[PDB]
Design an enzyme around this catalytic site. Structure first.
Site, PDB file in Angstrom:
ATOM      1  N   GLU A 148       1.971  -5.821  -2.509  1.00 46.10           N
ATOM      2  CA  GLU A 148       3.154  -6.166  -3.114  1.00 46.10           C
ATOM      3  C   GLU A 148       3.243  -7.382  -3.790  1.00 46.10           C
ATOM      4  O   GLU A 148       4.107  -8.323  -3.616  1.00 46.10           O
ATOM      5  CB  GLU A 148       4.295  -6.143  -1.979  1.00 46.10           C
ATOM      6  CG  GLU A 148       4.286  -4.836  -1.117  1.00 46.10           C
ATOM      7  CD  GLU A 148       5.400  -4.891  -0.153  1.00 46.10           C
ATOM      8  OE1 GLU A 148       5.040  -5.059   1.055  1.00 46.10           O
ATOM      9  OE2 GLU A 148       6.448  -4.433  -0.519  1.00 46.10           O
ATOM     10  N   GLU A 180       0.779   1.904   4.382  1.00 46.80           N
ATOM     11  CA  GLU A 180       1.933   1.678   5.562  1.00 46.80           C
ATOM     12  C   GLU A 180       2.519   2.855   5.469  1.00 46.80           C
ATOM     13  O   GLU A 180       3.100   3.467   4.514  1.00 46.80           O
ATOM     14  CB  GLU A 180       2.960   0.442   4.938  1.00 46.80           C
ATOM     15  CG  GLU A 180       2.215  -0.808   4.682  1.00 46.80           C
ATOM     16  CD  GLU A 180       2.823  -2.050   4.366  1.00 46.80           C
ATOM     17  OE1 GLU A 180       4.143  -2.071   4.400  1.00 46.80           O
ATOM     18  OE2 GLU A 180       2.299  -2.839   3.854  1.00 46.80           O
TER      19      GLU A 180
END
Ligand code: NA
Ligand code: NA
Lengths: 989, 989
Positions: A420, A496
C-alpha cells in the site's frame, strides 16, 4: 538576524531523505563460528519528549548519568511505561509534510557497558537487528553512524574504536523521523531498539557474505547447486561441504547433484552444509527447490502449488514488537496444526531467526520489504515517497537490506516490494534492483494493479466474483495492450483476503472452491494471523486486551488492530478453527450408506503415507464401532474410494428410524512430526443419520383460566400479556421475537455499492430493530384432543415510529409432559426505512429466564460457534459446555456464540433441565442481555445479571467480512419474510 | 374458541376514531355571574402501566381506595414523579399503526370529593379545560362521557347526577389513545388533567353562548357591532350594554356606533360590555377591529401590519403543561418589553385565560387548532389521519372546539388548522367549517403549500432569498393556474423562522429588511419563544435543565426541545436581546456630525407620542452631556430629522483625535404602560467616535538570550517552543492559533444542498480543526531601534494526517512598557478534505494563562455576546463583567460569549491587569478549555481548571440557523485565507 531555536541539528538529521550513514554493506544473516557477544539485557534508558530538549550532556560516555533508569533491550519502550502505544490504521499520527517531524517526538537514550575480550581484536562489528525508527550509535563516545529501515539490520565496523576490556555503547533513538512516512503499516507505533544487539568478531580470512543457489530439476531429480562466498564484496576461496550428499566443491562453482530430495512446505527437506575459509566457517541449511511461472501458474519444482496462507505481523501483548523465540516457535507449530502452508511477512522483514524456522517447519514465505506509504492516498498520493526521486536511495536501500538478509532461505519464494505504497518510480527501481540481484524469486507488489514491475498479479480483498473472473482469465483488459498481455500471463494471488476481524470471517469456502477450480489462482493469505491486543490489567486483578484509543491517542482506529485468527496470546478464534477445515489438504467424502469414503489427496507433492485413517460411529450413548483403515498411498492430486469395514454399513442398516448416529472419518498424523504429535487431526468428513423430527405432544391438557393467569400443563402465562411466566417452575421473565443481534465488527463496516452505504448496524438502528415492541391482539383457547385445548396468543411486533411490523402467533399445546410451541411470523406492511429495504439479522425467539444456567448441551454442530457462512470447522456431534465456554472472548464484545444446525438442546438450571427440540435451530445462551452485549466496548463491561438469555433462531443472516472486503454473500442474506416453526420444550428434574 | 385477553373494552374505547362522547355543544369560554366552584386542588391519584391491568375495582365511588396518593390537579403527572417526561420531535414514541395503542400506556385514575351547595341545582355542568390525551369521567359512579382533543375544553351536564352536598368526581386518563396520532407536536409527551376542572351552575333563562362581532370602519371611524347570544343553540332575548359608548342594544342586532377607538396590538383599546338575560350576565371586553386581505396584503383597520412574532408553547420547567397565571402574565409583559406584537399558539389552543391577556396587552394572535400528524411524513404520509375520512368527525370537532372557545377575542386575527399535518380532505373540511362559522378571520395552514383551503400563504424557514422572491410576487407558479392565481393574491407569512436554538439565531436582519421592503410580507414568528427545559436537581444542591434522553427515553430528540429565545424560567437568551433590536418599531439613525438623528416611525397605527427621546454622550470617564429632546409626534410610516442641542455637536467638534466617545439616542416609554414602567427602552441608535489605532511600542528593548529562555522586556519565552511563558509575570501556559470552536447547535445541523451534507461540526472533525499541532520552523532576533530588537517566531500549524497547513509568524516588540505582537497567517497547500473545501470557525489566538480571571472589561459591543450575523442588540460602549457573567448558560454547552468588535480589553487576574488593544477583535474569556466545552452535554460538566482561556479573534464565522432552516449566509462564511493582525499587550499592577 541570529537563529535561536534549539535542536536544529538533530532535527535536520531526523528529516534526512538518505539511508543511514556509516554502516557496512548489507549482507546475509549467517550462522558463523566467529566469536559473538549478545549485548541484550538490562540497559540504561532516558526519555526526552523531543529533539529540542533531548540533552547534549555528554551521556554517551556513561559517566554520572542524569535521569537514566533500567530498561530491557531488546524492547519496544512504550510497553514498559515510557509513553504509551498508539494505534493508527491508515492515518498518520502526525501532520503530513515530509520530511518534517512533529515537535512531540519521543527520544530514547540508551546505554550499555560491556566487556570486549581478545577474541574481538583486531576487527569486530556491532550489529543492530532493528531500531524504530531512527538510531544514532556511539561507541566510547565515537559516532558509528545512523540507522534507517526500522525492521532491517545495520552493522557498524568498530575496529580501532572498540577497546580491550570495558566499552560503553550509546544509542539515541527517535520515534519519528522522515522514515516514519514510509513505515505507515496498519499496527501499533512502537519506538525502540526492539531486536538483537550483537558484538561479532571479524577474523582475518573470513566470510562476510554467502549466497546459496539450490535449484531442483524435477525431470531428472538433480539438484543444481552453487554457493557464493565473499569477503569485503569480493568472491573468495572457500570450501563448501554437504556431507549427506557426498559433496565437496569450491564456493562459486555450479554443480549438478545427481539426486536430491526437493524442499517444499509439505516436505521441507534440508541438507546441512558448511562453507569454510581459513578464518571462518558458516553453517547453512540447503533446501533444493526451483520456482517458475509457466502457463500463468506459480510453480515450485515443476508443480502448481496452492498457498494456504496467513499474514503474520510481529506482536506480543506485553512486549510489543519483541516476540520471544518460544512464542515464535509455538505460533508456527500452531499454524502447521491448522493446515497453514504459507506466510506473508506483513509488512516488513521478520526477526532474522524466523527464516530458519520457516525452512524447517515448512512454509512458502512472501518476504516483504519494510515499506508502506498508505497515509498519502487520502491526498491523491501527492508527495508519496514512492514516486519522489529524493527518496530513491532510501527505498532501494530498504529493498537491498531486505533481499541480502534472507536470500539464502528455501522458504522464501517471493520478494515483495512493500505494501500500500501507491505506484511510482522508486518501486520500479526497487524491483529492477531485486530482479538483477536475485532472479530466482518472483517479485510481488499489490499496490500497482497494472503489475508493470512484478511477476505475479496480486490483489487484496477482491470479491469471490472478481476472483472467479480472474481465475478464468477474463477480467477486463488494462488500457495498455502490452501490460495487459503481461498481466494475463501471470498467476494471481490474494495477498490479503477474508478479513478475520471479530465474528467471522464469512465466505471462506467460496474462495477456496475457486482456488481448487482454477490453476491460475495461487491461493490467498488471510488477513491476519494475529490480533494485536495489548494486555491491560485493572486494580482488582483482571486482564483484558486494549485496542486503539485505549492508550490516550488523539487519533486512532479503535479495534481495527484486533482482526486476527488468534488473539495476542495465540488462543484460536473460531475463524481459525473454520479456516483449518476450509484449507484441509485432503478431502474425505463419506458415503451416505456408510460403506466407504472418497479420499482426495489435495497436496501438491506428498502422498497420503503420513496419515492414519480412523473411523468412529457415535450415538446417544457414545461410540458404537471404530478403528483404523489401511489406505494404499494416494498420489498428490489423485483420489480413491476407501471401503470401510462391513460392520459399519451393517450398523447403519440396522439403526432404528430416527435414532441419531454420526460416522466420522479422520486423517490423523500416523507419527510425530516436527509440528504436531501422532494422532493430530489434519482432515475429516462425516455422514449423519439425523434424529427423527420430534413428535409434537398430544394436546390433551386443557387451559386453566384464573383472573390474572392461565395454566396449560406445566406452563403458566400472564393473562395480561399472553406470554409464559414459568415453564415447569422455571421462571420466564420475557419471551418475544428477535430480528436483531449486537452488531459484529463486520456489521459496523460500510456496505459499498448502490445508493446505500450505511453499515448494516446503522441500517438496523435506523430501522428500530434493536427496540422492538409487541402489541397483544388476542388470546384464544381452542379445542385440542379428548377435552384438551391449545392456546393461541396473537401479537404484532414493530418499533416506535415505524409502520411495518410482523404478526407473530404462538400456539401452545401440552400432554402435561412436553410442551409444543408453534410460532408463525407474517410480514405486515413494506419493510423499507430511509428509502431502503430493511434486512434482518435473524428470525428467532429470546427467552429471558429468571435463573442462571450452568451447563449447555446440544446435538448439532460444534463445539465452536457457527453461522450460515461460517462454522465449516464445527462438526456434527453431541456437545456440552459450561455456560461461560459458550461465549467468544472477542476484544470488543459483539454477537457471537450461536450454534447453528442444532437438533436438540438441554440447559441445566441448578437442579432442573430445560430441553428444547425441533427442526434445526440456532442456539445461543448468555448470562447478559443483547443490549449489554451491544453497549460493551471491552469484556469487563459484560456483567452477569442472574438471568439466562436463551436464543432459539429459525433463521440467521451470515456474518461476511464487511469490516474490510465483501459483505455477506447473496445466499446468506436475510430479507424480511414470512416464517413458520415448531419447537418442543420439556422441563425435567 | 373463547377470548381470554384482558382490558379489551378500555382498549377499544382508546382506539376510537370518534370525538369524545356525552359532552355539551362546544361554546365560548365566558366570564359569567353564574355560580362556580373550581375543583382544582389536591386530588387522589393512582397510576397503572396499561389498560389491561388498570383495576376495575369500583374506585369511582371513592370508598376504601387501594393505592391512591395525593396529587395536585391541574397537573402533568410525570412532573410529579409518576413515570417520566419523554421528548420526541417528529418521531412517534410508539409503533405507528393507527388507531392502535401500545401495551405500555400509563393510565392515571383521578378522584376528588367536593360539596355542591343549593346554587348548583337544579342544573349544573362540569367543565374540563384540558386532559392529555383521553379522559373518561364519572360523577358519583355515573358515566358522564369522554374527552378527546387534549388542549380543548369539554363540558358535561351533571343535572340529576350531581347531588346536594357531597359528590365524588372520578376521571380515568390514558396517556396514549388514537388521538395521540394527531397530537404529534415537537414537545414533551405529558399526560394529565393539566387545566382547570370547574363546577358551574346553569340558571334558567341564562346564556350559554355569545359571539361578538365588532368591526371598524376606518374611513368613517364607526364601530359595527353585533353581539349574538344563545341558549341551547337558539338565539335568545338579551340586553347588551356598553356604558363607555352610551349604548344599549338587543343581542342579535347589528348597529353602527358613530365613533369607536379601534383595537390593535399597538393600541389595544377595549370597551367593557355586558350581555344580560333574566338569569345570567356575561362580561365582555370588546375591541373594534376588522381584518381584510387586499392587494395581496394582510390589513387590520385598513392598514397593512407587520407581525413581529413568536411561537408560544405552554411549558413550565417544574409543572410541565401547567403554566401558572403569574408566569403567563410575566412572560407576556416580557414579550412586549422586547417589542413582540404577535403570537402564534404553537400548536394548540392556549389556556383559556390567555386570550383576555392578549386582548389587554395587545398582540395579534394566530390561534391554532390542536392538530399535528408530522410522524406520518416519513412513511410518505400513508395512513395520515388528515386524509382518512374515518377521522373527519374527530378533526372537525377539534376545529369547532378551537373556534367556539376563543371567537370573541379581538387579539385573534387568524385561525390556524394545525401544524405539519400534511394535506387532505379533513383539513379541507376543517377550513370549510371555519369559513362558514366565522368569515371574519382569515385561515392559516402551512402544511399544504398550494394554499387551496387558506387565505394567507404561509411557510416555515423559507430562506431569505426565497422570501425576497415571494415578496416581489415572482416565486415559481403552482401547476394549477387557478390555485396559482389565488396564492399570488395572498399575503405571505413565515409561521416559523430564524430557529433560535443555542447560539443564534443568525440572519435575522436580512429577513427584517425584506419585511420592511415588501408589503406582501406579513412578517414572521420566531421559533420559538421558550426552551422546554425541565429542571433536574442533583444531591449536592445544583439545578440544571434536562432535555430529550435525560429521562430514560428509548427514542427521543435530545436538546431540540431547548430551542427558545428564553429559557424555561423565562430568562432571556442573547437571541431575544438581538431580536428586540431587530424588530424595534422606530428607527433612529444618528448623524455622523452629532447634529441630529433621523427618526422613522415604523409602527402601523400609533404615532411617537408615547415615547420620550433621550440623548447621552459617554466617554472614558462617563457621561459628558445628556438630556431629553422634544419631538412633535411623527405619524406611523413617516419620518423626520430631529435636531440635537448644539452643545452635542460642539462636544463632537472639540474631541481630541482618537479619543473614543459614543452618542446614544434612545426612545423610552414617557409613562408607565400596562407592560413596562416609564423609562423602558423601545428603540435606540448610536454614533461612535472610534478610539485611534494603538501606537505600537518602539522596539527599544533587545532580546536577552539564555540557554532555555529568551527575555524581551516583560515577556519570557521558552527557547525550545518560541512561545511566551509569562508576560509581565502572568504565566502563559500556551499560546497558539485557533481555527475551530466548540460546535453550536446550528453547526451540528446538516448543510442541505450540493454534494456535501455533513454538518459543519462533522466537516471540522474530519478536517482535524479541533486537533491542530504546531511545528516550529525557527526563531530569529532582528534589529529594531536604538539597539532594541524584534523577535520573530515562525511556525506551521496543521493536524495529524493532513497535508494542508498555515504558516503563522509572531513578531514581538517592546519598549519595556507595552508589547507589540504582529501575527501573520498564510495558507499553505489546498484546504480540502474528503473532496470538499474546509471552512474555518475563526482566525484567532488562544492564550492559556496559568491564573484565574475575576473580571473582564472592554470597549466595544455589549454587554451580551455578538457574532458576525448576530449581536444587533449589543451596542457600542464600555462594559465590565465578572468572569462567570461572560458565559451563556445554554442547556447544552457550546461556543458562546464572544464579544465581536472589541477595540480594547482588560482582564483582572488577582492583583494584575492584562490589557489588550488593537484593530477590532472578538474577545472571549473562559475558566475551562474548548475541549471541555465541546465534550460537555450539560452545564454541570463545565469545571473551572484554575486557568484563564483567552481568545482574541481577528475573524469569526457567523452562527446562522442551520439546526433548522438556513445556515450561515454567504457574507458571514469564513473560507481559509491569508491574514495579518496586530495586538498590543500591557500588564499593569
Ligand atoms: Na488491522
Ligand atoms: Na424543537
Amino acid at each position: 538576524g541570529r537563529s535561536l531555536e534549539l535542536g536544529a541539528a538533530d532535527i535536520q538529521d531526523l528529516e534526512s531523505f538518505e539511508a543511514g550513514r556509516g554502516a557496512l554493506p548489507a549482507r546475509a544473516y549467517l550462522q558463523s563460528d566467529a566469536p559473538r557477544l549478545s549485548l541484550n539485557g538490562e540497559w540504561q534508558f532516558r526519555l526526552s519528549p523531543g529533539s529540542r530538549v533531548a540533552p547534549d550532556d555528554g551521556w554517551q560516555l556513561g559517566e554520572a548519568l542524569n535521569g537514566f533508569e533500567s530498561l530491557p533491550v531488546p524492547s519496544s519502550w512504550p510497553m514498559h511505561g515510557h509513553g504509551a502505544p498508539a494505534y493508527t490504521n491508515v492515518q498518520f499520527p502526525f501532520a503530513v509534510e515530509p520530511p518534517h517531524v512533529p515537535e512531540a517526538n519521543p527520544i530514547g537514550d540508551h546505554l550499555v557497558v560491556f566487556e570486549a575480550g581478545p577474541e574481538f581484536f583486531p576487527h569486530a562489528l556491532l550489529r543492530f537487528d532493528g531500531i524504530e525508527s531512527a538510531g544514532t550509535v556511539w561507541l566510547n563516545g565515537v559516532e558509528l553512524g545512523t540507522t534507517r529501515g526500522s525492521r532491517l539490520a545495520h552493522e557498524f565496523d568498530v575496529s580501532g574504536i572498540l577497546e580491550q576490556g570495558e566499552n560503553t555503547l550509546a544509542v539515541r533513538v527517535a520515534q519519528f523521523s522522515a522514515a516514519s512516512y514510509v513505515e505507515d503499516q496498519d499496527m501499533w507505533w512502537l519506538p525502540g531498539i526492539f531486536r538483537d544487539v550483537t558484538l561479532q568478531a571479524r577474523p582475518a580470512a573470513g566470510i562476510d557474505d554467502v549466497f546459496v543457489h539450490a535449484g531442483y530439476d524435477h525431470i531428472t531429480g538433480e539438484g543444481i547447486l552453487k554457493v557464493e562466498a565473499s569477503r569485503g564484496g569480493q568472491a573468495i576461496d572457500a570450501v563448501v561441504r554437504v556431507p549427506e550428499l557426498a559433496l565437496e566443491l569450491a564456493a562459486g562453482t555450479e554443480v549438478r547433484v545427481p539426486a536430491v530430495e526437493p524442499w517444499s512446505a509439505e516436505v521441507p527437506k534440508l541438507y546441512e552444509a558448511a562453507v569454510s575459509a581459513a578464518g571462518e566457517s558458516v553453517a547453512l541449511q540447503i533446501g533444493f527447490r526451483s520456482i517458475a511461472i509457466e502457463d500463468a501458474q506459480f510453480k515450485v519444482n515443476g508443480r502448481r502449488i496452492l498457498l494456504r496462507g496467513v499474514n503474520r505481523h510481529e506482536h506480543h501483548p506485553r512486549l510489543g514488537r519483541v516476540v520471544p523465540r518460544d512464542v515464535v516457535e509455538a505460533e508456527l507449530r500452531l499454524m502447521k496444526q491448522h493446515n497453514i502452508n504459507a506466510i506473508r511477512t506483513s509488512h516488513y522483514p521478520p526477526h532474522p531467526q524466523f527464516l530458519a524456522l520457516a525452512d524447517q517447519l515448512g512454509f512458502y514465505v512472501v518476504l516483504e520489504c519494510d515499506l508502506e506509504t498508505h497515509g498519502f492516498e487520502s491526498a491523491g498520493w501527492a508527495q508519496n515517497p514512492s514516486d519522489d526521486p529524493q527518496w530513491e536511495d532510501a527505498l532501494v536501500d530498504r529493498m537491498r537490506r531486505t533481499v541480502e538478509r534472507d536470500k539464502n532461505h528455501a522458504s522464501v519464494v517471493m520478494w515483495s516490494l512493500g505494501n500500500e505504497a501507491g505506484t511510482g518510480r522508486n518501486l520500479a527501481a526497487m524491483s529492477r534492483w531485486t530482479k538483477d540481484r536475485d532472479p530466482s524469486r518472483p517479485i510481488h507488489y499489490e499496490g500497482d494493479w497494472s503489475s508493470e514491475h512484478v511477476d505475479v498479479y496480486s490483489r487484496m480483498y477482491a470479491s469471490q466474483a472478481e476472483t472467479a473472473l480472474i481465475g478464468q482469465g477474463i477480467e477486463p483488459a488494462l488500457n495498455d495492450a502490452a501490460l495487459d498481455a503481461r498481466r494475463r500471463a501471470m498467476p494471481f494471488v490474494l495477498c490479503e483476503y477474508v478479513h478475520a476481524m471479530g465474528n467471522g470471517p464469512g465466505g471462506m469456502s467460496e474462495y477456496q472452491a475457486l482456488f481448487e477450480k482454477y490453476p491460475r489462482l495461487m491461493g490467498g493469505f488471510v488477513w491476519e494471523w494475529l490480533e494485536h491486543g495489548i494486555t491491560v490489567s485493572t486494580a482488582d486483578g483482571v486482564d483484558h486486551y486494549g485496542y486503539g484509543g485505549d492508550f490516550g491517542e488523539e487519533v486512532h482506529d479503535g479495534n481495527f488492530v484486533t482482526d486476527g485468527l488468534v488473539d495476542a496470546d495465540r488462543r484460536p478464534r473460531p475463524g481459525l478453527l473454520d479456516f483449518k477445515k476450509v484449507i484441509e489438504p485432503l478431502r474425505i467424502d463419506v458415503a451416505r450408506d456408510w460403506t466407504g469414503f472418497t479420499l482426495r489427496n489435495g497436496q501438491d507433492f506428498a502422498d497420503t503415507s503420513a496419515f492414519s485413517f480412523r473411523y468412529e460411529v457415535e450415538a446417544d450413548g457414545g461410540a458404537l464401532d471404530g478403528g483404523t483403515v489401511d489406505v494404499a498411498p494416494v498420489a498428490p492430486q489423485s483420489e480413491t474410494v476407501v471401503e470401510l469395514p462391513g460392520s459399519v454399513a451393517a450398523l447403519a442398516a440396522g439403526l432404528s428410524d430416527g435414532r441419531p448416529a454420526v460416522l466420522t472419518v479422520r486423517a490423523v498424523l500416523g507419527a510425530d512430526s516436527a509440528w504436531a504429535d501422532a494422532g493430530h487431526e489434519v482432515a475429516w468428513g462425516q455422514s449423519v443419520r439425523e434424529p427423527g423430527a420430534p413428535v409434537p405432544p398430544a394436546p390433551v391438557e386443557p387451559v386453566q383460566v384464573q383472573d390474572s393467569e392461565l395454566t396449560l400443563g406445566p406452563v403458566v402465562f400472564s393473562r395480561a400479556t399472553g406470554m409464559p411466566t414459568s415453564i415447569g417452575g422455571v421462571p420466564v421473565e420475557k419471551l418475544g421475537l428477535t430480528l436483531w443481534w449486537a452488531p459484529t465488527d463486520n456489521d459496523l463496516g460500510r456496505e459499498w455499492g448502490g445508493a446505500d452505504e450505511r453499515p448494516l448496524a446503522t441500517q438496523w438502528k435506523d430501522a428500530g430493530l434493536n427496540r422492538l415492541h409487541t402489541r397483544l391482539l388476542g388470546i384464544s383457547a381452542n379445542p385440542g384432543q379428548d377435552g384438551g385445548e391449545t392456546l393461541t396468543v396473537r401479537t404484532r411486533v414493530s418499533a416506535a415510529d415505524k409502520q411495518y411490523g410482523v404478526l407473530v402467533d404462538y400456539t401452545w399445546s401440552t400432554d402435561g409432559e412436553t410442551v409444543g410451541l408453534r410460532t408463525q411470523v407474517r410480514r405486515d406492511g413494506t419493510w423499507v426505512n430511509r428509502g431502503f429495504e430493511v434486512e434482518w439479522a435473524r428470525i428467532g425467539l429470546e427467552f429471558v429466564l429468571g435463573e442462571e444456567t450452568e451447563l449447555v448441551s446440544w446435538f448439532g454442530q460444534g463445539p465452536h460457534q457457527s453461522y450460515p457462512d461460517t462454522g465449516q470447522g464445527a462438526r456434527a456431534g453431541w456437545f456440552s459446555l459450561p455456560l461461560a465456554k459458550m461465549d467468544v472472548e472477542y476484544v470488543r464484545p459483539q454477537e457471537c456464540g450461536a450454534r447453528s444446525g442444532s437438533r436438540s438442546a438441554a440447559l441445566q438450571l441448578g437442579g432442573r433441565t430445560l430441553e428444547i427440540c425441533g427442526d434445526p435451530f440456532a442456539l445461543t445462551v448468555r448470562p447478559y442481555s443483547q443490549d449489554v452485549l451491544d453497549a460493551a466496548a471491552h469484556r469487563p463491561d459484560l456483567k452477569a445479571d442472574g438471568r439466562t438469555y436463551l436464543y432459539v433462531d429459525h433463521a440467521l443472516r451470515g456474518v461476511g467480512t464487511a469490516a474490510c472486503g465483501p459483505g455477506v454473500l447473496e445466499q446468506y442474506r436475510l430479507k424480511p419474510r414470512d416464517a413458520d416453526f415448531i419447537l418442543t420444550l420439556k422441563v425435567r428434574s
